[PDB]
Ligand binder design. Sequence first.
Ligand SMILES: Nc1nc2c(ncn2[C@@H]2O[C@@H]3COP(=O)(O)O[C@@H]4[C@H](O)[C@@H](COP(=O)(O)O[C@@H]2[C@@H]3O)O[C@H]4n2cnc3c(N)ncnc32)c(=O)[nH]1
Lengths: 178, 183
Amino acid sequence: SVAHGLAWSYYIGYLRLILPELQARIRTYNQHRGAVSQRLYILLPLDCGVPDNLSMADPNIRFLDKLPQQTGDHAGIKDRVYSNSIYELLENGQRAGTCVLEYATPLQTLFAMSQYSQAGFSREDRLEQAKLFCRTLEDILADAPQNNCRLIAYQEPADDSSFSLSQEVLRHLRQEEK
Amino acid sequence: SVAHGLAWSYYIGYLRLILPELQARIRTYNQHYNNLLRGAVSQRLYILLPLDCGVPDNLSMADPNIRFLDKLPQQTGDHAGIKDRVYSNSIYELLENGQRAGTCVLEYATPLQTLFAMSQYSQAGFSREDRLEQAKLFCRTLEDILADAPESQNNCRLIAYQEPADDSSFSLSQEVLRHLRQE
Ligand SMILES: Nc1nc2c(ncn2[C@@H]2O[C@@H]3COP(=O)(O)O[C@@H]4[C@H](O)[C@@H](COP(=O)(O)O[C@@H]2[C@@H]3O)O[C@H]4n2cnc3c(N)ncnc32)c(=O)[nH]1
């Protein structure tokens, strides 16, 4: 399936590369505002709505800083760069938490495939594959040599805004301190 | 299929983003940093597609006649809440009889590394036979996408080939030079 390939791709070509070094990059950051959480928070919107900017999703999520770049040779690209961003989460206009946060990039591929005629990929296919991506990725991480990351999958109906993405991420950050 | 998704992902998440500005980056490079009259960086991204899905981390180690020269000017952008994501491409010289015989922007197709890993990991349920079948389909699907894509305009060449990276007789530089010389 489309999702099977994307989940393996995201694990092999990204998470397996950045998660073993994440704990250390946060140290180089932390002590060198506000301790940043230790885990990479990965947002999995099942509708595959992935904006370039998180503040677009929720104005209470604001970019704060970049972690130091991780660079390395991969597939003939000398000094490929992987970068991650730290965001503050505001509550009543003030900072309530900070964490390394991003959307799962393969969900942009599912979205764009649903939009390109030649991909032969419907909106129903997109939802089914977004689900299968999440499940497949989770099953991989469950025995992947999880501790450095937290996956948050969620669905939001289209005509409906009872949803605060910043509040949900804050709930998770608070539970982890515990 | 697996290959369908991986080819679309390579297009959506990479080639559609880098191909529109590639020739401007190459022109900048040749105009300002490389005034060698027979040494101009070629105008297309050459993408290596080893059908056994053997992708080395270091392209130049697998041939003494491929030498890293420099990087193109970086391309940067915000994507999926990653600020200033960087897309980099490397320029290599291709040596023949000790001379610089070609110069090009060269890299392996990254999704092939995925097909290789899937064939290695039990949990992927993906055989070596599946891997060869999907590699071939990946190549076909990518060719069909690029043929219709507005971003692909004499600026990308796929180079598919059967030989293992641990060749002995096969020369990767010769394989690339043969295509460079046909344009
Ligand atoms: N050679 C090359 N290939 C790239 C590059 N960026 C992406 N690709 C490949 O294009 C496909 C889609 O990539 P995404 O960035 O949308 O999601 C890819 C994909 O889902 C998975 C595997 O990535 P790769 O092995 O590098 O190959 C990708 C992938 O085949 O990790 C994601 N990923 C890779 N780099 C990053 C990254 N830096 N930040 C967030 N996600 C990333 C790139 O910079 N150089």
